[PDB]
């Protein structure tokens, strides 16, 4: 029984180790890289539509904050349950995923319309993160219930996302265009699929990986699902622009 | 200096009053009404597309949870800052607003396409709530910084939402259709505008209204922006269906 004075709060959980020093170094190193790779990307985009820029801009801001305030509220939530919920992550998710799926709905970027599949793809996406976040907060079996909701909404997201890649495959010309679309799909599903995997391995789930360890992994698939994927998406719209210069609209 | 034993946590803020008994009664009474009005609406919709149903379904689930677990995690977050952030509210916001704005982008419900205005309207909407939520969590001037971000994203949302109502005004026929569109716009902006107002009056802001008091107000504008607005939207699509039965497509 410890003695906490006056206003100051207390909770055994908030003092838990953040991770080994080795993981701390690995995290910060990747943090700088992520900020540097995004700065070179923003330069590249600015030099040479908003879907690649805005997303990359949010990625730069995040890592900067994740380097200065990763464990400081409200980037990290210190709940009365003693668990540390990384709100910074789930907040950034809500700001990027929608744009990435909007980019997904219009891979070629030629058309000016969006189908009803996009609405469902967005709705299910935002819901997945919501449940997933509520899971990180929840405690007990409730944490499982909400994770299950995350799997259902997530499945619907991957379901419409798959149909989007397929329609995007048979739409684009059979050359390096379809080669890229496939490369985008694999980079997409692998990365996007790793998040619920890391979630289970991290402090939000069974806590195999430490907080620093979770960030090390996330930053990796953040560059995969954001920077690299968006760059591939950009390359596709360039190849599509190169095809309509040769054979015109077709 | 109090003595907290072992694992159990402590924080002066988590013990703060929830509100007067009168407000407690007013809240629960409205909670039942909201659940009853949504049940009659769900019956009405089922009897007689998904935009009105799904939204009304989430409204029913919420109030049910807000009646059983309003102050229980993770419906409410007990942060180390001593502040009680109602995550239930901000989570439900992310699940409904997008659908309501999607309904807004296709008022007549005739077309099968969505413009780029919808993407911006959604993106800015989801961002507003994110910042607004981060504000409820944040402490100090940072709470102001993030609220400002909420005003900017929110402004962009109201901006595209206004253009959507205007395009929706000159699109629908000049009869009871345009009369309804105007009634939907006023019900929309008033209600939607009240949220940041209640936020400032509530425990998240300057705390003029209690936690029970904040819920009393929110539930009111939740029925305005959700149930009543969606019902108006439904009525519009019925009137539009009545016009194309008389004068055909025009
Ligand atoms: C871009 C995505 C923003 C997420 C919200 C997270 C904002 C985190 C703000 C941290 C600032 C705090 O500072 C208080 C001392
Ligand atoms: C299926 C994923 C469900 C995710 C829920 C994982 C929670 C595991 C857990 O909390 O058990 C560890 C133990 O309580 C010590 O913290
Ligand atoms: C594709 C998969 C990418 C994840 C990369 C592998 C996961 C990276 C996690 C490594 C960490 O481990 C450090 C340890 O947890 C000290 O706290
Ligand atoms: C529909 C919108 C859902 C919001 C997530 C809030 C879910 C709130 C779940 C509360 C259950 C808890 O129970 C643990 C004891
Ligand atoms: C402009 C809205 C900014 C919203 C920020 C409102 C915070 C007001 C506040 O926290 O002051 C009360 C005092 O600290 C006792 O709790
Ligand atoms: C349109 C405006 C609707 C808000 C209705 C007025 C706001 C309702 C708040 C009333 C409450 O006051 C109880 C007091 O806070 C005890 O805790
Ligand atoms: C000095 C206190 C630092 C608090 C860190 C603030 C970060 C909050 C995370 C919210 C998510 C924002 C995403 C990045 C933009
Ligand atoms: C017994 C513990 C009760 C906890 C309440 C759970 C509510 C969490 C709120 C999350 C938002 C969900 C919105 C309603 C669906």
UniProtKB/TrEMBL annotation, chains A, B:
Disulfide bonds join 9-11. It comes from the Eukaryota. It is found in: Membrane. The chain crosses the membrane at residues 29-47, 144-162, 183-202. Belongs to the archaeal/bacterial/fungal opsin family. This is Archaeal-type opsin 2. It comes from Chlamydomonas reinhardtii. The chain holds residues 26 to 281 of 737 of the full protein.
């Amino acid at each position: 029984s410890v003695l906490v004075p006056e206003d100051q709060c207390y909770c055994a959980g908030w003092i838990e180790s953040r991770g080994t020093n080795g993981a701390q170094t690995a995290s910060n190193v990747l943090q700088w890289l992520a900020a540097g790779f995004s700065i070179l990307l923003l330069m590249f985009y600015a030099y040479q539509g908003w879907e690649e820029i805005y997303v990359c801009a949010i990625e730069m801001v995040k890592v900067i904050l994740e380097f200065f305030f990763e464990f400081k509220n409200p980037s990290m939530l210190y709940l009365a349950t003693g668990h540390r919920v990384q709100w910074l992550r789930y907040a950034e998710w809500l700001l990027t995923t929608p744009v990435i799926l909007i980019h997904l709905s219009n891979l070629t970027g030629l058309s000016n319309d969006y189908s009803r599949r996009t609405m469902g793809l967005l709705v299910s996406d935002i819901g997945t993160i919501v449940w997933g976040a509520t899971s990180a907060m929840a405690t007990g079996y409730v944490k499982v219930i909400f994770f299950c909701l995350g799997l259902c909404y997530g499945a619907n997201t991957f379901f419409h996302a798959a149909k989007a890649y397929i329609e995007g495959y048979h739409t684009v010309p059979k050359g390096r265009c379809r080669q890229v679309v496939t490369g985008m799909a694999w980079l997409f599903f692998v990365s996007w699929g790793m998040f619920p995997i890391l979630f289970i391995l991290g402090p939000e789930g069974f806590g195999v990986l430490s907080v620093y360890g979770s960030t090390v992994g996330h930053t990796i698939i953040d560059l995969m699902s954001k920077n690299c994927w968006g760059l591939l998406g950009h390359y596709l719209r360039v190849l599509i622009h190169e095809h309509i210069l040769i054979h015109g609209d077709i």
